[PDB]
């Protein structure tokens with residue numbers, strides 16, 4: 305493994321995040337005071353049948369040297385479940401691939417959540433047409449990270465310092 309960390313988004317630079325939604329639901333994103341400097345506020349309104357998400361498509365799919373993904377999250381002031389997602393690259397030249405999820409719940413205080421890659425679970429509610437269907441998370445072949453819906457409720461949260469974590473020392 306690599307030793308240390310590799311920052312994906314501290315939210316001090318290029319706005320890397322797009323939004324998507326369907327069937328009633330909405331999400332919008334903006335820059336605000338984050339955990340250090342600036343972070344990204346996420347506002348959503350869930351629907352029963354609908355969906356919402358914010359997405360970064362990474363310029364590098366090769367994550368196999370690292371052990372965890374980490375980020376700082378906080379709710380803006382009621383508590384509601386969301387999902388953080390890793391998606392592999394498509395096998396058919398279009399769209400994304402196999403979706404890997406971890407549930408989290410922002411609260412009134414800042415929390416650093418560090419998820420081992422081996423604690424992600426394969427998404428059970430949806431897979432895209434482009435998936436490898438391997439049942440494995442292939443860390444040499446990552447397309448995109450997301451924050452996205454878990455339910456039909458509404459909420460607000462702020463994220464900051466999204467990074468990869470390696471080993472402690474050589």
Ligand SMILES: OC[C@H]1O[C@@H](O[C@H]2[C@H](O)[C@@H](O)[C@H](O[C@@H]3[C@@H](O)[C@H](O[C@H]4[C@H](O)[C@@H](O)[C@H](O[C@H]5[C@H](O)[C@@H](O)[C@H](O[C@@H]6[C@@H](O)[C@H](O)O[C@H](CO)[C@H]6O)O[C@@H]5CO)O[C@@H]4CO)O[C@H](CO)[C@H]3O)O[C@@H]2CO)[C@H](O)[C@@H](O)[C@@H]1O
Nearest residue numbers: 322324326353354355357359361399400429430432447448
């Ligand atoms: O056929 C009989 C009856 O059907 C009813 O309709 C059904 C239909 O059959 C079901 O298929 C449908 O199921 C939906 C399901 O489709 C929906 O899936 C979501 C999924 O949850 C989201 O995660 C996914 O989000 C993607 C975005 O769309 C996409 O824009 C975004 O793309 C990313 C880019 O923005 C980015 O720049 O780059 C990325 C990669 O480089 C890129 O991919 O990606 C995200 C993630 O992939 O969207 C899909 C929807 O498109 O999930 C919902 C929630 O459960 C299901 O409901 O259900 C309908 C019923 O509502 C007919 O209505 C009926 O008449 C027929 O009889």
Ligand SMILES: [Ca+2]
Nearest residue numbers: 314340341342
């Ligand atoms: Ca920051």
Ligand SMILES: [Ca+2]
Nearest residue numbers: 402436438440
């Ligand atoms: Ca796979």
